[PDB]
Amino acid sequence: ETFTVKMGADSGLLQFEPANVTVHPGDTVKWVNNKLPPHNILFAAKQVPGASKELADKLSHSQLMFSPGESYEITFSSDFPAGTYTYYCAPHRGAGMVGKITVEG
């Protein structure tokens, strides 16, 4: 299954929509620019399983995404452990543009 997460609400609010997604192994999450880019996707290394910098860095798209509808996707293969993964947008972290992926299993 593929879960689409909009970056930016239709109104311009700096939010991921939906902010919380639950996935199963093999599922994909696809972030897509919606309103008021640029956005990016940074996983907090203290807020992924094992507090792994490697894992957080692997999942992140640190490069700013400027283009309308620009997309980034992660397929959660077996090298992604069960647990919750919290991420944020660096441009809008202060404003609370934060999200969470829960990997079940």
Annotated binding site: 39, 89, 92, 97
- Judged by CB, which is closer to Cu ion: 14, or 74? 14
Sheet (strand 16-17) strand order: 16-17, 2-7, 28-33, 71-75
72, 61 Cβ separation under 8 angstroms: yes
Q: Which residues are catalytic?
A: 39, 89, 92, 97
Tell whether residue 39 is a contact of Cu ion (CB under 5 A).
Answer: yes
- Judged by CB, which is closer to Cu ion: 50, or 96? 96
> Closest residue to Cu ion, Cβ-based?
89
99, 31 Cβ separation under 8 angstroms: no
User: Is the bond leading into 25 cis (omega within 30 degrees of zero)?
Assistant: no
Tell whether residue 89 is a contact of Cu ion (CB under 5 A).
Answer: yes
Distance in angstroms between the alpha carbons of the first and the last residue of the chain? 15
Tell whether residue 97 is a contact of Cu ion (CB under 5 A).
Answer: yes
- Judged by CB, which is closer to Cu ion: 39, or 61? 39
Residues lying near Cu ion in the complex (CB under 5 A): 39, 89, 91-92, 97
